[PDB]
Amino acid sequence: ATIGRISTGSKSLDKLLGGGIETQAITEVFGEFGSGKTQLAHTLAVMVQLPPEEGGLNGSVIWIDTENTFRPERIREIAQNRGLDPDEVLKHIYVARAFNSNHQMLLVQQAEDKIKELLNTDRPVKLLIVDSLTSHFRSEYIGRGALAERQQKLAKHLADLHRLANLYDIAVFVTNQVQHSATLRVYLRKGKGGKRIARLIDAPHLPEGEAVFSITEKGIED
Ligand SMILES: Nc1ncnc2c1ncn2[C@@H]1O[C@H](COP(=O)(O)OP(=O)(O)OP(=O)(O)O)[C@@H](O)[C@H]1O
Ligand SMILES: [Mg+2]
């Protein structure tokens, strides 16, 4: 019942987040193309595998990929440069490509089976990524009347995700490209000098500053 926190790799971003992204919660990162959403996802997929005194949860990962932007060699690089075995780290990320939004929804149901399989194991699922949460919905539900229909399907999908996060004490991390029912929304944008900036949105009771980070051979870090 106590929540867990997964470090992002960036001390700055971690502080903004109160220590890292939370289990029993959906964290949505949103921003324009190139703002670092997928790179943050790759980094979290390594960080969660660390022990807790290093900011992880000794956990496995389920990743639902909608745009085929998952890169196993990037996982291996991030792992290697953080002192972890690249191939063991990869072994604990279960990637499924979602062919369309309906398949994406079924995949969340299959994720529950894998979650059960690894539960009470030494590396239970502690992170579930959906990258991108919205891309299929955006292409499939379009035109007059689509707004209500799309929002309803997305709400159902997010309800499924919330249930997994809460039932099994998992952190859910979803991405959304810009030009809501997530627990926490984090807006990401590219700044000067290769920096990325993060801001919490519509969360008046949480830190109101901005975090600043870089994307490196370690994934994300200050
Ligand atoms: N190995 C690396 N080292 C340093 N920077 C990198 C590396 N790989 C990617 N990047 C940076 O990450 C950027 C891409 O970030 P990312 O794919 O997370 O964007 P995104 O927000 O997911 O975009 P979209 O919405 O288009 O999918 C690149 O333009 C580059 O600046
Ligand atoms: Mg991306």
Swiss-Prot record:
GO terms for molecular function: ATP binding; ATP hydrolysis activity; ATP-dependent DNA damage sensor activity; damaged DNA binding. The keyword Transmembrane helix does not apply. ATP binds at residues 31-38. The keyword Nucleotide-binding applies. One of its GO terms (biological process) is DNA repair. Keywords: ATP-binding, DNA damage, DNA recombination, DNA-binding, Nucleotide-binding. Belongs to the eukaryotic RecA-like protein family. Involved in DNA repair and in homologous recombination. Binds and assemble on single-stranded DNA to form a nucleoprotein filament. Hydrolyzes ATP in a ssDNA-dependent manner and promotes DNA strand exchange between homologous DNA molecules. This is DNA repair and recombination protein RadA. The lineage of its organism: Archaea, Methanobacteriati, Methanobacteriota, Thermococci, Thermococcales.
